[PDB]
Design a protein around this ligand. Sequence first.
Ligand SMILES: O=C1N[C@@]2(CCc3ccccc32)C(=O)N1c1cncc2ccccc12
Ligand SMILES: O=C1N[C@@]2(CCc3ccccc32)C(=O)N1c1cncc2ccccc12
Lengths: 302, 302
Amino acid sequence: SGFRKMAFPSGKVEGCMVQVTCGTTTLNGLWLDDVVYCPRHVICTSEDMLNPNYEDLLIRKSNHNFLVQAGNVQLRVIGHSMQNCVLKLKVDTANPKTPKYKFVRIQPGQTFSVLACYNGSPSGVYQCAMRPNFTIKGSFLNGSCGSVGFNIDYCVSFCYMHHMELPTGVHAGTDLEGNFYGPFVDRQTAQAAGTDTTITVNVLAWLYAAVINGDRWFLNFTTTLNDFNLVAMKYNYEPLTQDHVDILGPLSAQTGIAVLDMCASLKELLQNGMNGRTILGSALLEDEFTPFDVVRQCSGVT
Amino acid sequence: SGFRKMAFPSGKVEGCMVQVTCGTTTLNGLWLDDVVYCPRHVICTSEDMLNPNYEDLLIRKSNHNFLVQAGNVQLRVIGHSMQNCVLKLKVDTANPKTPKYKFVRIQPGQTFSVLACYNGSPSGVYQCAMRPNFTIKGSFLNGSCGSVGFNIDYCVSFCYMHHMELPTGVHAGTDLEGNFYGPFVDRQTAQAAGTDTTITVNVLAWLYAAVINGDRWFLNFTTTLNDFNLVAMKYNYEPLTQDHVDILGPLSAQTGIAVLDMCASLKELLQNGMNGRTILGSALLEDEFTPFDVVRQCSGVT
Ligand SMILES: O=C1N[C@@]2(CCc3ccccc32)C(=O)N1c1cncc2ccccc12
Ligand SMILES: O=C1N[C@@]2(CCc3ccccc32)C(=O)N1c1cncc2ccccc12
């Protein structure tokens, strides 16, 4: 029994983390085969970050201007190019620790594990979700740039590289092809995220995890997808699609509660609050577990 | 910025996880050098667990009755002994992936990372605390027995091996010398944990993490260690010692708030509740961060 915010084991990603230095700036990079991936703003001084012309700034740079360090070893840069907001530094050594991997662009609401790093060394791992407004609420200090987010599908699917913190204190970054998630650019200006919404299909997945673990005080009614969605829009919950009802099916089958019945329970929680109770140790509705996360934890995928 | 329940990177422990089989039972073991460590109840059938005589049960067993598997490799058992509630199976191969390590018995209130495993394969990692009543609120399914908890001090300090779930749904286990934490025995009977209490020094550490991250709405008064402790005992908070005030000193020095001032803020939160607000995204007072955890996260120890 029990339910925890669980991250994937991080061993496979640790052996890929290197420290990249250009000029005075040092951040983390991802070394797979003979390429090293890092945020392109490593080439920027602080004057540069107000209005960086990245092409122009990168043109002034040659291979030997990049100090890639792997542990104590120093790698040799024999090539550099800029794919979107990511720098690709080709080096002289294939990483012998390269796992099977894919690069993946995840969807808002999906979860992934983050290995937070500084100067190329891992410091901690945690689980989080891509918010509907394409930000993440992470834990990132200066020099954590280039820390990666990932899933393990038995193969490492890298989905996120950290670039920047917004004055909000929320975090933004790119996929491993350098395309930002969200409307953000790698520049030090005022950038607004959208209004955030709650991942409704994830909250329902968690209520099922709650029932699986003996927490059932919130159950009861029914409602319609259409009727439920009217309550959700009022509470800044993201609208429940039928894909979403389908994804919850196996969870429905193992608790013997129809999705639509579970939504009626949620509607009452949204309308009436929690009246001081807790669900799985939380006094709030938790939205950072996908249905796949719940099933992975509640039957032990390794 | 940002604050997350962060676990240590798990790479070093993954390369130590093996699958141990005796009879029909299969659980996880810890392979360091030429010894493999696992819960001794691996030798038990289900009839045995009501009233196991472990010496007698282990006497019927010979080395070849133990199937230790490391990945696909099968290790050769050339020795077996029982230290308290742990079995020590000596094998023919030193593990080439053995990190620098120590065995450590932690104290109630300390935190550690758990690598949850099944059949010798890692599935997830999470951070938790030894409760004052020596239980842990984990996430453990059948066959997760022998999963280990650990800290990384730059060296892996193993502090916990999981043995059993109580009807509560909370979890109990031993140090790596096989001595249970708490009053528990490895037997399937009714076993009561103590009344649980809140780790007061950890809650204060979290309020400091809250201030560090811009959440300051709860600040204000003063009070005395003696006066504060009177409020704590009423709310089932563990009493604040002067060691505890000392440990919080560096946190005090960097936020410019005296410990005793922070306690006055907490007293009012305990007495008056949170009135619907949140602190660092939580609607409850969080007690699973030590002051060392807060300092590790808020300045990036790797
Ligand atoms: O937030 C930013 N803006 C910076 C400088 C401006 C910029 C432009 C493009 C990309 C990143 C950045 C940057 O390097 N970071 C950081 C990212 N993560 C954690 C941080 C913790 C403390 C201070 C900065 C942090
Ligand atoms: O709780 C127990 N009691 C058992 C059998 C009785 C016993 C005696 C000594 C030690 C352990 C045990 C056991 O193997 N476990 C488990 C431990 N962890 C997660 C579990 C999830 C689901 C079912 C069991 C779980």
